[PDB]
Structure 1
Amino acid sequence: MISLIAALAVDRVIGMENAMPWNLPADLAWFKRNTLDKPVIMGRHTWESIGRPLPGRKNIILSSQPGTDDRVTWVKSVDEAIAACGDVPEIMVIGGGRVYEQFLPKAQKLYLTHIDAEVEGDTHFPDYEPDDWESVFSEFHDADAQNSHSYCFEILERR
């Protein structure tokens, strides 16, 4: 299956013109836990943001332009991106906006992090229909010495 994994601020904001104004090591730890040993598909801006290949995952970049990093796999189409995952049980799509948009229809699960942050966004998570998704897990945490905002982990399965 294909799963989408994202951190949404209020109003589904996922990205801004510059780095998101938060510091959530626990969210990053949740992201690593749920993507480790899985192939991850991303767009070019997200790759550029990450700054390096994510360790222990097969990194696939979906883009129309030629790639510039020999350490990852560059594909030009959603179909190519999938085939590039080969035979695995679950493919993780990590954004951003357009990539989430194109893969949502084919997705069966969403791993979401809701952060209580009000910001002006540039890109947002596509609108999903809560009537079509079943929340199977949820876990609330307040901001703390190491995390700047409060956040809640959620896993949804397509009804």
Structure 2
Amino acid sequence: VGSLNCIVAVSQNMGIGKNGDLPWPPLRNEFRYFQRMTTTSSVEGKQNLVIMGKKTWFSIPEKNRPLKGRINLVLSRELKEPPQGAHFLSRSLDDALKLTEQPELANKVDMVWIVGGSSVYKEAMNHPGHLKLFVTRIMQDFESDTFFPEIDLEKYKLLPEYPGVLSDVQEEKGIKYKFEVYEKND
């Protein structure tokens, strides 16, 4: 297994969702970037693994489920089997990760990407070792009911730049947003 990464889009008030939806109107290019970043494998014949909670899986339209070209794993404690369309179910982040390290997916997975929700982000962010946070900062306030945890700048450094990530302000539906990359190693 390669790289452990987190990807999230957050509003200025740190909101990541509302009533199981996105707090903002859909942003086609922000989704394009989420798709490209998670699907792309930096090693041939390998696939990226996408880890998400139960609410995140149920938040993507059915037609877009499962995310194509990636291994989808749902993190749940109540589910007995993966939702329909899903490929793996783990009870925890640590179990999801051990599965990687099985001859099963062993030879199969390149990078591991955590795509939501808060509880999932909150624990990855505390998982020790190397980690990168891919943050899309949606530059306005939006009514939200679920937030991204606080980024500890004493541990995560904002990268001045990063290969294949635009550095300037983006704008869609007259909504301004920018791409950020933070790295930790502890």
TM-score (norm 1): 0.88
Unaligned runs of 5+ in 2: 40-46
**Alignment pair present for 1:28 and 2:28:** no
Which runs of at least 4 in structure 1 moved beyond 6 Å after TM superposition? none
Question: Partner of 2:80: helix, strand, or coil?
Answer: coil
Change in CA separation of 1:90 and 1:71 when aligned onto 2, cut-off 3 Å: closer
- State the partner residue of 1:53: 66
Q: Distance in 2 between matches of 1:152 and 1:9?
A: 11
TM-superposition CA deviations, 1:20-71 (whole Å, max 9, x none): 2222111111111111031010001110111310000000000012233254
**Counterpart amino acid of residue 25 in structure 1:** R
Q: Distance in 2 between matches of 1:85 and 1:93?
A: 14
Pairing 1:10-159 to 2, within 5 Å after superposition: 10-20=12-22, 21-36=24-39, 37-50=47-60, 51=62, 52-64=65-77, 65-67=79-81, 68-69=83-84, 71-86=86-101, 87=106, 88-106=109-127, 108-136=131-159, 137=161, 139-144=167-172, 147-158=173-184
Rg larger in structure: 2
Which is helix-richer, 1 or 2? 1
Q: Distance in 1 between matches of 2:71 and 2:144?
A: 29
Q: Distance in 2 between matches of 1:66 and 1:148?
A: 43
Unaligned runs of 5+ in 1: none
TM-superposition CA deviations, 1:87-115 (whole Å, max 9, x none): 44431100111111121112510001000
Do 2:6 and 2:114's aligned partners in 1 also have CA atoms closer than 8 Å?
yes
Query: 41-50 vs 133-142, which deviates more?
Result: 133-142
Percent identical pairs in the alignment equals 29
Q: Paired residue for 1:6, among 8, 11, 14? A: 8
TM-superposition CA deviations, 1:108-147 (whole Å, max 9, x none): 1000100023112111111111232222226233424xx4
Question: Partner of 2:59: helix, strand, or coil?
Answer: helix
Do 2:71 and 2:87's aligned partners in 1 also have CA atoms closer than 8 Å?
yes
Change in CA separation of 1:48 and 1:148 when aligned onto 2, cut-off 3 Å: farther
